[PDB]
Structure 1
Amino acid sequence: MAHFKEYQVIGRRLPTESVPEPKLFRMRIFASNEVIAKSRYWYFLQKLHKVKKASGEIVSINQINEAHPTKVKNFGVWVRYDSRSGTHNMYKEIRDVSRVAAVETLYQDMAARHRARFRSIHILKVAEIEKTADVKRQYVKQFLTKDLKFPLPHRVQKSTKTFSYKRPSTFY
């Protein structure tokens, strides 16, 4: 829950003489360190298969780096979450350079707008959106128009000293 890395977690039920070689399951988990990621792996597995980590084991844990960490992409994000009064699915879009960058703004946004802390959200799917205008959401489409430019009116420069011998301007 912080500056996110994304991990492959791969685990399985412990072998039995009856079933050596039990099936392997993978999740992609966003977390900040690997102790959290494996926690998170088990949290989800327990809600999906009978297994507690006391009957299972983690076979591999590997960080998945962004393939094109400077191509700008538009991501579709699918999320399940709890409100003070129920639980909701929700599709949002995020424009960024990496999943890991996108996911982190997802979490800030769920916090800002819906007052959802991390314990309350599940990431359902995160996906680069291939064709522009499969993009559904205005506040990301806006950036997709041709020869896009804008000013940044009213610039405030931070001052290094407490007094200034001239009245400042906001001119950019």
Structure 2
Amino acid sequence: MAHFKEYQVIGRRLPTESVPEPKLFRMRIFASNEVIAKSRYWYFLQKLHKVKKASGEIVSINQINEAHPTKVKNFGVWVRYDSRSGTHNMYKEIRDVSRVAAVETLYQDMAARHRARFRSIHILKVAEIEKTADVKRQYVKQFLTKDLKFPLPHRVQKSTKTFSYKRPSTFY
């Protein structure tokens, strides 16, 4: 694969004689490829209404992009998953001016602040919030203070050549 892309997959099973023009459903899948996109749409639909790639078809495999990626996206996550034992539930607030990567910080946050593989992960509600108070996590409300700025010490300079002859400082 690679990095995520939100796909607008809309399936309606496989229309038969008695089931012409089925009800139809739009489930949102993530991943970089479309084959891995439809694979996820069918397992998830393999968890709702009785089917498999054998009894139904995903009408289309569309894409999804942000209409205003110049504003800071203060997202509020919601996810379901398993564990090296059973299964649990969770909620976060990952910020980023891009949906798919806020979800990558998640698939990484699952393997980092919990050590859990992508497989063991079903992402659900991902809705940016408006009002500052609506924001729960204060370590996300950490960058909401009015009139803000901030510096960064110990600039560990990248060495392209082996031996240096200055023995550098933290200047930054």
TM-score by length of 1: 0.96
Alpha-carbon offset, residue 87 of structure 1: 1.1
The structural deviation recorded for 1:73 is 1.2
Contact 1:75 1:94 in 2 (8 A): yes
1:129 and 1:9 map into 2 onto residues whose CA distance is 25
CA RMSD of aligned residues (A): 1.1
Equivalent-residue separation in structure 2 for 1:22 and 1:101 (angstroms) = 34
Q: Distance in 1 between matches of 2:100 and 2:66?
A: 8
Asked whether the 8 Å contact 1:83–1:114 carries over to 2, the reply is no
- CA drift of 1:129 comes to 1.1
Distance, in Å, in 1 between the alignment partners of 2:61 and 2:150 is 44
Q: Gaps spanning 5+ residues in structure 2: where?
A: none
Q: After TM superposition, give the deviation of residue 130 of structure 1 in Å.
A: 1.8
Question: 1:25-61 CA deviation, whole Å, 9 max, x = no partner?
Answer: 1111111110001000001001000111111011111
2 CA distance for matches of 1:53 and 1:166? 64
Between structures 1 and 2, the one with greater helix share: 1
Q: Which residue of structure 2 lines up, in the alignment, with residue 148 of structure 1? A: 148
Does the 8 Å contact 1:8/1:64 carry over to 2?
Answer: yes
2:59 aligned partner? 59
Could you list the runs of 4 or more consecutive aligned residues of structure 1 that deviate by over 2 angstroms after TM superposition?
A: none
Asked whether the 8 Å contact 1:13–1:23 carries over to 2, the reply is no
- Identity over aligned residues, as a percent? 100
TM superposition score normalised by structure 2:
0.96
- Alpha-carbon distance, 1:12 to partner: 1.1
| Matched residue, 1:159 | 159
CA deviations 1:37-95 (Å, max 9, x no partner) are 10000010010001111110111111101121221111111000111122111100011
More off after superposition, 157-166 vs 74-83? 157-166
SS in 2 for 1:136: coil
Q: Matched residues in 1 for 2:132 and 2:62: separation?
A: 31
For residues 151 and 120 of structure 1, what CA distance do their matches in structure 2 show?
38
Query: Which residue does 1:129 correspond to in 2?
Result: 129
Local SS of the residue matching 2:126:
strand
Distance 1:47 1:139 in 2: 35
Deviation for aligned residue 1:23: 1.2
What CA distance in whole angstroms lies between the structure 1 residues aligned with 2:162 and 2:98? 40
Instruction: Say which structure is richer in strand.
Output: 1
